[PDB]
């Protein structure tokens, strides 16, 4: 058992004639203390005095309304008592007439009004009081004091911000309203001068709303775009809900529709010159939250360059190329530019390749080209891919060696030299001499030699006065090119080189002149002149003098006669010139 | 969203005059002004309910009549359908607060210019100077004011100095009673603000005056035991303002109400004669069962802000009949 102890003690009050005063006494003890209200020790009761009890066996409130002055003006006391102990508390009451209401005394300018919220909905009560010093606002429900100690909970207190000039505003906020909250509410304004009550306002509480409000939601969201630099586009945004929200367009932070005029529910955006890219927000707001949704407006101007321009097949006169598109977006087709490596001339351009693989034809064999790839769609040609260099590898020479020539050195040795093919076709890996002592054998049995890009070689151990046959070809690393021939040379002394600038002209109907140039070899016995009446003639030889030109006579008019030269040295015969024919007048 | 409900300041106005409804929240509740609210990236929105509780439609503006200049709404003119509650909302996206402001579009009372139920109220004294104002105009601001009397242009006597927004009767007569309606141009339209003038006698400086009973004459009331008793005090008050008359009874040093226990009680103060603005009031003592017990001294007390006067009566009984 415990003796009674105060949980809430009454505080002094100063009210106004024909108004209200309330005093509070709440107490705890075992067993539950009874509470009694006294004026000078005596349990007073009076029709102008009403005592109200808390629902819990705690304490009670003494309410005096309407106040009468100066009768009520007296010293009162609260006494709580049980058969285990007794407690009492004193407090003073003062009442005024309005003939001497101090300057700066609270006045109600507007009091709470009847409000009807549904159960589990947020209800707000409003009040207006002024005074100097600033008034304190408190609340009573069904005559009892509310007090919200934890300030955080279903039931919380709102406070005005005192600008220097206005009445104090004040409210009571009830989250999740319940039927227990039903009842008769009155508010109370206090300061160092005294206390004033507003008029009573009842609160009502209903079960459900017919229908509640609708938060804002997008009926027609804002849809992304690609457009040309400075084109036009109509972008529509529509929001709905209850109440209907406004729609302002927004560039992220800044608002695009001007506040003093902001359309309702349906704003459609007209665009002029997008140069640079941007981000457009469309906001809708009702009283049930703010919603957002963005549109991306961007302009492109070109495809990116392809990647991986790599060859998966090649031939001597074509190359098959493949590349990845390299692009996220829809390109129409690609164009390839190419020219030879280290060329400063303009690139060639190939239009319309609708795929990521392509074979380039009409190229020249074993020829160097430089490539990049650019993608094109309807805006313009983008930058080139990184470039690639690649040599068209030919798989074999396609022409015989040129200028196969030979001249004699000593009696058991000859000197063979030549010049590179017009169609070298690759890195020349070497040259081949098919020398032999027996010019009637199958080729794998003749004898074998080798040159490696030296244009010249010697062959020895020949036996004097024997016929050797000789043929020459070039080869690359892939394989062999074509053979040349014109040698079955006999091994004795050195020989001169066939003349150059060899031409024949008909000086007359029965005479013809010949112009030729003698080689370096000064020691010259004579030149050989094989002439024959046309094609089916006899091979007759004529003795010409070692000079520069000669005059032949004794021929038939308007008739063709072939001729073939071969320099003749006093040590041995040379090489033969190109086959020319001349017609008599 | 924190709702502050209907604001204290009401807007009432005659069908056909311009009206500028400011948003109350800037001018009292919240700390900042409108321009700053915008800067901090807050939206300002208006909704219109037709009363409580009709759901608020976001109110469709033209630009002519019902426009929306910076922190207020302009009506030019006002229309009967314009009546209602106008919710005014402010918003971050983590912040939401609104208040309602009440607007009443009324019509002239049959035959007049003012609306009978929509006029201010003032009071004045004979032989003392009253200054009628023309208030709540501040939004239209020294143009010409045409004061009417009972809605008719009159030629004013010489004691009436018109300045700008005021008019000053240096010496108030009884004739001065009535409905002063003032008029003003702007828009262009016409706005009216009418105030009714009631005049009173000057402030009395003398204590009240007893009638029943006289402050000297010890008057006596006959009663028999067991009967019921009516001691009706009657006194006169000079104009003491809005203060309710202070007249009451007493028994010795006991005040009546505390003594009772439902046998002896004071009535409710009847006003017998009321006239600009001096009164003849009455309050009576009532004794139900007359004991012995109750007999004797009952004094009526009268009082204002000028002193306290009391008169005295006697409660007693008639003996045996004329037999002596
Ligand atoms: C103690 O004893 C005294 C007796 O002296 C009682 O005092 C009177 O109480 C009666 C109650 O009936 C009052 O009677 C009323 O008279 C009023 C005055 O008349 C009006 O008309 C004149 C015009 O000639 C005006 O100048 C004047 O100001 C009044 O307005 C009336 O107002 C009363 O009401 C109405 O009655 C009829 C219904 O029949 C209505 O149709 C009328 O419109 C009229 O308004 C009533 O007639 C009387 O005024 C009291 N006198 C005094 C001096 O106070 C106490 O009542 C009594 N106390 C008790 C019993 O508790
Ligand atoms: C000033 O205006 C008021 C308000 O209209 C007038 O009060 C009216 O008085 C007549 C008396 O003839 C009554 O019938 C009406 O019912 C009253 N109306 C209201 C609304 O109270 C008053 O009469 C006017 N003053 C003058 C001198 O005419
Ligand atoms: C906007 O929201 C912020 C949140 O930090 C809040 O502090 C502020 O009071 C709100 N209003 C304004 C006008 O900034
Ligand atoms: C309504 O007001 C007008 C002034 O605009 C006035 O002339 C008219 O008389 C009033 N209506 C009635 C029925 O009096």
Numbering used by the authors:
A (entry chain A): 28 to 612
B (entry chain B): 31 to 171, 176 to 358
Can you list sentences taken from the study reporting this PDB entry?
Vertebrate type-IIa RPTPs comprise LAR, PTPσ and PTPδ, which share common domain architecture with a single transmembrane (TM) helix flanked by a large extracellular domain (ECD) and cytoplasmic tandem PTP domains: the membrane-proximal PTP domain (D1) is catalytically active, whereas the membrane-distal PTP domain (D2) is inactive. In mammals, presynaptic type-IIa RPTPs form trans-synaptic adhesion by specifically binding to their cognate postsynaptic organizers through their ECDs for inducing synaptic differentiation of neurons. To elucidate the structural basis for decoding the ‘splice-insert signaling code' in the type-IIa RPTPs, we determined the crystal structures of PTPδ-ECD in complex with IL-1RAcP-ECD and IL1RAPL1-ECD.
To elucidate the structural basis of the PTPδ–IL1RAPL1 interaction for trans-synaptic adhesion, we determined the crystal structures of IL1RAPL1-ECD in complex with PTPδ Ig1-Ig2 and the full-length PTPδ-ECD at 2.7 and 4.4 Å resolutions, respectively. For crystallography, we used a PTPδ isoform containing four Fn domains and both meA9 and meB, which is the most abundant in the developing brain and has the highest affinity for IL1RAPL1 (Kd: 0.15 μM) among all the PTPδ variants. PTPδ-ECD binds to IL1RAPL1-ECD at a ratio of 1:1 and the asymmetric unit contains one PTPδIL1RAPL1 complex. PTPδ-ECD exhibits an elongated shape with a length of 180 Å along the longest axis. The Fn3 domain of PTPδ is oriented perpendicular to the Fn1-Fn2 domains, as observed in the PTPσ Ig1-Fn3 structure. The length of the PTPδ-ECD·IL1RAPL1-ECD complex along the longest axis is 206 Å, which is equivalent to the average length of excitatory synaptic clefts, implying that PTPδ-ECD is kinked at the junction between the Fn2 and Fn3 domains in synapses. On the opposite side to the IL1RAPL1 Ig1–PTPδ Ig2 interface, the Ig1 domain of IL1RAPL1 interacts with the Ig3 domain of PTPδ with a buried surface area of 694 Å2. In the present PTPδ-ECDIL1RAPL1-ECD complex, the meB insertion appears to adjust the relative spacing and orientation between the Ig2 and Ig3 domains of PTPδ.
